Amino acid sequence: KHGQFTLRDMYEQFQNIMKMGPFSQILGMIPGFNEQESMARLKKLMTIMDSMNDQELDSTDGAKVFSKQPGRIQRVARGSGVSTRDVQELLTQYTKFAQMVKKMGGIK
């Protein structure tokens, strides 16, 4: 996009609003999902990642990265003013979410 607006843009936006209900109902069987009281939980989880680096983000097995090198968890916790447990929690949900995605597809 270029500070402007093309039909593809309008398209992609409508498209985002699509992979909603789905992705939303995919959060179905995952203890860690009250609309407003959820947004926070979702914004938190994001801010925590706002502290991870590319290599950590783009890792097929993020859980392990952090597993194997705990210092990374500490770096992240402290870097996002959140607790350590919080980070490990975010890490497990990401796992559950991964495993889930596996049983189905991924992009959708």
Partner: protein, 107 residues
């Protein structure tokens, strides 16, 4: 109007920039806001513990590492509460010296 005493102030494991306020020679291992309050209250000082407050220069979030302690120096009229305690430095030091004596530490 009471004053502020953060454990970082009395921590010999912290550098200057990390919040240490007294010479390492007088500083202490890992003073806990609790211990600080427990020695101050036991000298005739008026003080209350702010259990959950956290020192800004304290990256850690654990418990042994947080809390704040508040002591009354002067009295509304102006007179110091305890002649032997002018400044804040005075209290910090007095605390740094008495904690390594708390039974809970000599244990």
């Amino acid at each position: 109007r009471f004053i502020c005493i953060y454990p970082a102030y009395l921590n010999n494991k912290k550098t200057i920039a990390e919040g240490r306020r007294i010479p390492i020679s007088k500083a202490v291992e890992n003073p806990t806001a609790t211990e600080i309050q427990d020695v101050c209250s036991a000298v005739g000082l008026n003080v209350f513990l702010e259990k959950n407050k956290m020192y800004s220069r304290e990256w850690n979030r654990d418990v042994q590492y947080r809390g704040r302690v508040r002591v009354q120096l002067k009295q509304e009229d102006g007179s110091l509460c305890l002649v032997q305690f002018p400044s804040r430095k005075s209290v910090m030091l007095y605390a740094a010296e008495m904690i390594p004596k708390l039974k809970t530490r000599t244990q």
